[PDB]
């Protein structure tokens, strides 16, 4: 899961993923 890999290594992305999941967080951060 490269999206999770990238997003987990950004505290803001990971925090967003805590709320909306990694795919949505990644899209909002790295879309």
Q: Is 7 exposed, middle or buried (0-12, 13-18, 19+ CB in 10 A)?
A: buried
Q: Phi, psi at residue 19, to the nearest 5°?
A: -95, -35
Q: Which resolution, in Å, applies to this structure? A: 1.3
Residue 8 known to bind ligand = yes
Q: What span, in angstroms and rounded, lies between the C-alpha atoms of 19 and 22?
A: 9
Q: What is the CA radius of gyration of the chain?
A: 7
The token pair that represents 2 in the structure block? 């490269």
Q: Is the dihedral of CA 3, 24, 26, 15 positive or negative?
A: negative
**Structural domain harbouring 1:** 1-31
Task: Provide the token pair at 31.
Answer: 């879309």
Give the chain's domain count: 1
Token code pair at residue 1:
């899961």
24 labeled part of a ligand binding site? no
């Amino acid at each position: 899961e490269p999206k999770r890999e990238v997003c987990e290594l950004n505290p803001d992305c990971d925090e967003l993923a805590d709320h909306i999941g990694f795919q949505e967080a990644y899209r909002r951060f790295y879309g």
